[PDB]
């Protein structure tokens, strides 16, 4: 029965994306083949089953660099990283398969479901 | 792009889980004798005071912040919970402390809602 601020979560996420864009308090670089992406571990863990598992693993929790499977499409990864920080998923016919396979790997179940629905819709 | 209307609230819920588990928290906020662990990114995202503090290169890496000792720790507790939940627990017995703490933390819409609460009582 508390007072709900309906825009608060999206305002927080916008500000987290602002911090990312300025490289403020980022603490990890994700490597996907030749491409690198700086991020906040906390956001990655809050958005992805794989990243939650990685950053709670004793072996990997203190690492500043995480190498993902180099078979992952870096554009597919970047689409999902942007989604994590914006709530907007840029699905197109040209990227649906790579995004869907990357979302499986990252363990982002509602993304995968939406990719399946995108296939149904086209 | 396709909008996921529940995503931001789900992210915030998971950040609150991390806070409760003390996972990747990087600062303790001291309010009188009371200690609150948090993530500086969330604090910067939710508070003009913490944004201004941690944006400074010479203060970015601080692991302890001592707030003004006149701040009511329950007022801070309410506002920290709000930062991580979007829910504000306002009561007649805490309104003045929450309002003054939100002024100090530079949380403008909380202050506005406290003014509305005063207008309604
Ligand atoms: C390990 C659990 C369970 N334990 C028993 C207790 C503690 N747990 C826990 C977990 C977490 N992190 C997560 O849950 C990370 N995460 C985030 C999501 C997720 C997806 C989407 C999307 N659109 O796909 C989304 O919009 C969104 F907003 C999301 F959040 C997700 C997921 O879809 N899947 C998975 N993990 C996801 C795995 C399966 C699919 C954190 Cl931070 C925390 F503190 N505790
Ligand atoms: C300066 C901006 C705009 N520029 C154009 C680009 C850079 N910007 C920026 C800002 C930030 N951080 C902040 O804005 C910190 N912050 C957060 C809030 C805030 C309050 C509430 C509430 N209910 O009260 C809320 O629900 C909510 F969701 C909030 F977010 C807030 C505020 O109310 N006030 C102040 N600061 C607040 C000062 C005055 C009042 C971060 Cl992290 C970042 F990376 N960039």
Swiss-Prot record, chain A:
Residues 26-93 form the BTB domain. It is found in: Nucleus. Changing residue 110 to A: Abolishes interaction with NCOR2 and HDAC2, no effect on interaction with CTBP1 and transcriptional autoinhibition. Changing residue 53 to A: Abolished ubiquitination by the SCF(FBXL17) complex. Expressed in germinal center T- and B-cells and in primary immature dendritic cells. Phosphorylated by ATM in response to genotoxic stress. Phosphorylation induces its degradation by ubiquitin/proteasome pathway. Induction: Down-regulated during maturation of dendritic cells by selective stimuli such as bacterial lipopolysaccharides (LPS), CD40LG and zymosan. Protein levels decreases upon genotoxic stress in a dose- and time-dependent way. It is linked to Chromosomal aberrations involving BCL6 are a cause of B-cell non-Hodgkin lymphomas (B-cell NHL), including diffuse large B-cell lymphoma and follicular lymphoma. Approximately 40% of diffuse large B-cell lymphomas and 5 to 10% of follicular lymphomas are associated with chromosomal translocations that deregulate expression of BCL6 by juxtaposing heterologous promoters to the BCL6 coding domain. Translocation t(3;14)(q27;q32). Translocation t(3;22)(q27;q11) with immunoglobulin gene regions. Translocation t(3;7)(q27;p12) with IKZF1 gene 5'non-coding region. Homodimer. Interacts (via BTB domain) with the corepressors BCOR, NCOR1 and SMRT/NCOR2; the interactions are direct. Forms preferably ternary complexes with BCOR and SMRT/NCOR2 on target gene promoters but, on enhancer elements, interacts with SMRT/NCOR2 and HDAC3 to repress proximal gene expression. Interacts with histone deacetylases HDAC2, HDAC5 and HDAC9 (via the catalytic domain). Interacts with ZBTB7 and BCL6B. Interacts with SCF(FBXO11) complex; the interaction is independent of phosphorylation and promotes ubiquitination. Transcriptional repressor mainly required for germinal center (GC) formation and antibody affinity maturation which has different mechanisms of action specific to the lineage and biological functions. Forms complexes with different corepressors and histone deacetylases to repress the transcriptional expression of different subsets of target genes. Represses its target genes by binding directly to the DNA sequence 5'-TTCCTAGAA-3' (BCL6-binding site) or indirectly by repressing the transcriptional activity of transcription factors. This is B-cell lymphoma 6 protein. It comes from Homo sapiens (Human). The gene is BCL6.
UniProtKB/Swiss-Prot annotation, chain B:
Changing residue 109 to A: Abolishes interaction with NCOR2 and HDAC2, no effect on interaction with CTBP1 and transcriptional autoinhibition. Induction: Down-regulated during maturation of dendritic cells by selective stimuli such as bacterial lipopolysaccharides (LPS), CD40LG and zymosan. Protein levels decreases upon genotoxic stress in a dose- and time-dependent way. Expressed in germinal center T- and B-cells and in primary immature dendritic cells. Residues 25-92 form the BTB domain. Phosphorylated by ATM in response to genotoxic stress. Phosphorylation induces its degradation by ubiquitin/proteasome pathway. It comes from the Eukaryota. The BTB domain mediates homodimerization. Its dimer interface mediates peptide binding such as to corepressors BCOR and NCOR2. Interaction with corepressors through the BTB domain is needed to facilitate the rapid proliferation and survival of GC B-cells but is not involved in the T(FH) formation and BCL6-mediated suppression of T(H)2 and T(H)17 differentiationrequired for GC formation. Transcriptional repressor mainly required for germinal center (GC) formation and antibody affinity maturation which has different mechanisms of action specific to the lineage and biological functions. Forms complexes with different corepressors and histone deacetylases to repress the transcriptional expression of different subsets of target genes. Represses its target genes by binding directly to the DNA sequence 5'-TTCCTAGAA-3' (BCL6-binding site) or indirectly by repressing the transcriptional activity of transcription factors. Homodimer. Interacts (via BTB domain) with the corepressors BCOR, NCOR1 and SMRT/NCOR2; the interactions are direct. Forms preferably ternary complexes with BCOR and SMRT/NCOR2 on target gene promoters but, on enhancer elements, interacts with SMRT/NCOR2 and HDAC3 to repress proximal gene expression. Interacts with histone deacetylases HDAC2, HDAC5 and HDAC9 (via the catalytic domain). Interacts with ZBTB7 and BCL6B. Interacts with SCF(FBXO11) complex; the interaction is independent of phosphorylation and promotes ubiquitination. This is B-cell lymphoma 6 protein. It comes from Homo sapiens (Human). The lineage of its organism: Eukaryota, Metazoa, Chordata, Craniata, Vertebrata. The chain holds residues 8 to 128 of 706 of the full protein.
């Amino acid at each position: 029965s508390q007072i709900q601020f309906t825009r608060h979560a999206s305002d927080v996420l916008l500000n987290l994306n602002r911090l990312r864009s300025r490289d403020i308090l980022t603490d990890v670089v994700i490597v996907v083949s030749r491409e690198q992406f700086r991020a906040h571990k906390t956001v990655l863990m809050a958005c992805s089953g794989l990243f939650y598992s990685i950053f709670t693993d004793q072996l990997k929790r203190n690492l500043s660099v995480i190498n993902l499977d180099p078979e992952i499409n870096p554009e597919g990864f970047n689409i999902l990283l942007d989604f994590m920080y914006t709530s907007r998923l840029n699905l197109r016919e040209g990227n649906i398969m790579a995004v869907m396979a990357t979302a499986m790997y990252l363990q982002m179940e509602h993304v995968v479901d939406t990719c399946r629905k995108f296939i149904k819709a086209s």
